[PDB]
């Protein structure tokens, strides 16, 4: 009884999360061919940290977490250790000691359309930066000015989430990208996710 890791369910999901509400799937007790993903022409970003992508088929991990969401092309650079900006600061934060791979591809053909796609949101305002792998789905009115908001959206009192409103004719930096982050867990425990 050897299970194939369900990476298809992650990369080929019909629906992707907004980055503020990023999805996590835990992958365990299974075999994966990472070489097939790494050697795929489908991905414009495949960047690994703490491990060599060429060795992945020879390693075992205690778990793999697959996080996925949509951001703009010009924000994919923020999905890396040690980065700053609205996405790394307020939406999805990798730790300095990250062991894992960041995978991205252009999704303009699925995630934009004539009239705009307003479904994908991001957090624009927050009182402090996210901790690594923190998810914030709260919607407290953000006080930007001197007047207390008392929970009321208005002048200098901001709802903290905004829509990308992806427009299909915008250039590549504005276009939606689907991102999958694979975190390779290294607990001092039996390692249940292996290569072939």
């Amino acid at each position, epitope marked *: 009884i050897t299970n194939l890791c369900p990476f298809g369910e992650v990369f080929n999901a019909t629906r992707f999360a907004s980055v503020y509400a990023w999805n996590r799937k835990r992958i365990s007790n299974c075999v994966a061919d990472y070489s097939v993903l790494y050697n795929s022409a489908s991905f414009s970003t495949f960047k690994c940290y703490g491990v060599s992508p060429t060795k992945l088929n020879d390693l075992c991990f205690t778990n793999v977490y697959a996080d996925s969401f949509v951001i703009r092309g010009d924000e994919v650079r923020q999905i890396a250790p040690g980065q700053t900006g609205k996405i790394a600061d307020y939406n999805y934060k990798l730790p300095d000691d990250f062991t894992g791979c960041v995978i991205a591809w252009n999704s303009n053909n699925l995630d934009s359309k004539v009239g*705009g796609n*307003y479904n994908y949101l991001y957090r624009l305002f927050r009182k402090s930066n996210l901790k690594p792998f923190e998810r914030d789905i709260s919607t407290e009115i953000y006080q930007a000015g001197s007047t207390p908001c008392n929970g009321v*959206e*208005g*002048f200098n009192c*901001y709802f903290p989430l*905004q*829509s990308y*409103g992806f427009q299909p004719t915008n250039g590549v930096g*504005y276009q939606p990208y689907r991102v999958v982050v694979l975190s390779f867990e290294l607990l001092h425990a039996p390692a249940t996710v292996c290569g072939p």
Partner: nanobody
Amino acid sequence: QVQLVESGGGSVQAGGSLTLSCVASGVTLGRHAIGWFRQAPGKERERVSCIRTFDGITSYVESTKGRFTISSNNAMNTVYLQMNSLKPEDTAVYFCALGVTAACSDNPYFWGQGTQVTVSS
């Protein structure tokens, strides 16, 4: 602070077309309602069109439906009013107006200086 930078408008012949642009600064489009009002000679300032930049949903008044289409490009912080099938009675000062909520039905808070549109018969 918030500024609405308006451009476009001027003189056009009846049945012609114009495009007004409104660029917001000091705010990022993607949450708030933003739209167009106009004031024609002898008439009170009135609603023309509005778009919710949170969800792209547009709203119109009886006189503007079909001929005018409001659109946003949130990444460009720009909204557009494409004015087609223009008539002399469309002659007015057109104002970009930005809300402090997501709802088009709410009252505008920030106003542009306005742009003259003159339609000749």
